Symmetry: C2
Subunit: 278 residues, 2 copies
Amino acid sequence: SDLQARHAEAFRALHTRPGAFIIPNPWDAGTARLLAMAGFEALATTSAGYAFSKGQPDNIDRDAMLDHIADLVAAGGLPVSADLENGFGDAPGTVAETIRLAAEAGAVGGSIEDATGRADTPIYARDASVERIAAAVDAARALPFPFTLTARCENYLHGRRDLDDTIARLVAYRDAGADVLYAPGITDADEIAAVTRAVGAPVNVVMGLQGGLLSLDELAALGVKRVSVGGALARAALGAFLRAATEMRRDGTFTFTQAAVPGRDINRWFAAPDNSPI
Amino acid sequence: DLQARHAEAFRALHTRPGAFIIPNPWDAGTARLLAMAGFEALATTSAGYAFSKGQPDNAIDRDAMLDHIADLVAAGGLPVSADLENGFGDAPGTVAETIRLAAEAGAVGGSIEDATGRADTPIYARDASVERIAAAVDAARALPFPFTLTARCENYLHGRRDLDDTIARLVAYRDAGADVLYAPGITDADEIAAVTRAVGAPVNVVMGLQGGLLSLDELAALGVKRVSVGGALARAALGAFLRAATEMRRDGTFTFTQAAVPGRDINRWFAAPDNSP
Ligand SMILES: [Cl-]
Ligand SMILES: [Cl-]
Ligand SMILES: [Mg+2]
Ligand SMILES: [Mg+2]
């Protein structure tokens, strides 16, 4: 991969052109392929989608994720932003190593969140959080291509729905060198517009995780740059899977198969040596 | 002993009256969910597994399928019947080794089909086919628990919609010792009745592959013992995935998320230490 450097630049450029773009979240090679064929320009991994595929609830082994990143890089042929949880450890050096490893696995971007995993103290202290992002940035800037670092503030997922602390963290992460800022759980249009105005740098908003829905155009008008979907695609697939299971158990019928992608089509598409829209 | 109890449970499904559905998961999560939905056994799918891997059907190797069976045995906690394709080679001894390995991976049954993968000679000659099933039967009989061997005739998937030759193959496979007979692609009710009338031993019919649909009741009235879905559950899942992708590309909206399983539900279910209903 001089390919990696090409993807890195293409990915960074998605963030500076006008409008917002969607970064969808496959959880296996198949889905990665299909999203490229659909015309998406980047992919993001989903620790949640990945977990559901393994029959586990959300929250992951670093080595398992590194393998997963490499699988989706190979399959998709697109730039991949990796969900790297909290960097798989508390210490800044751990976060930094995680960034290097994720790049080595082929990612051209990734996210580091400020959730500790400890219910007592579910969000890292501001100082410690910023030091963490600073270490991630230094690792990112030592790479020989532009690595797009997303800094996550997890406040709204852990009962601290405080807009002002959340903005302050994101601003502090931006000032530490983060390229993209993301607060999952903020869904209100007015709250989102205040985030994007205060942050200025690119903001990612996730759709379908909680609350209400906005379109990509609505989000662009609120100043959002990137829109992701976390585990929602995996959960869409699973909702259809469950409806089929239920039909079979309750009725003994298979009409669910009528809306399935025909075998003939998917075998043709996956027989191709690339993911050309087609 | 757990594999022995499953093997007995799976054998018993086939001998009890009426028909049953054997659904086809393609990962650990789909295996757990089917077990939670109250199904009594699971079948792997060469097709569904390939598609998760970004591969067309019949592109997966034996070692990968073996790991996959073991993953699904562990995740589901139910008897597993493995799609073992053509046994991953032409030679009877390769077929026999595939059965032994499948059993080692935790399967209590599996299927060996008569497709060669050679476009211009797509189905094994009769004698060769029977020899292959004989070797599978010998390997199954060497196991310390009853292994339920399904013998597949692939005629209908390779442009030979010849009911008589297909029947005659499944009868030959039965006479060589196969426990279950399966010809994918037959969906006509009269054809299916002709198959179960000629074969007598348990028949598997697949639904959702091609052609028409019938209910489990309708299939059981035609003599069918087992109804599978091959890659159709994977393809269903993928259908929904694709409608979501298309919605996002066309409209830039995310309303597909309304029909998705809530995250709170899937996390609660998978946090469980087992697959209780
Ligand atoms: Cl999710
Ligand atoms: Cl299929
Ligand atoms: Mg996570
Ligand atoms: Mg197959």
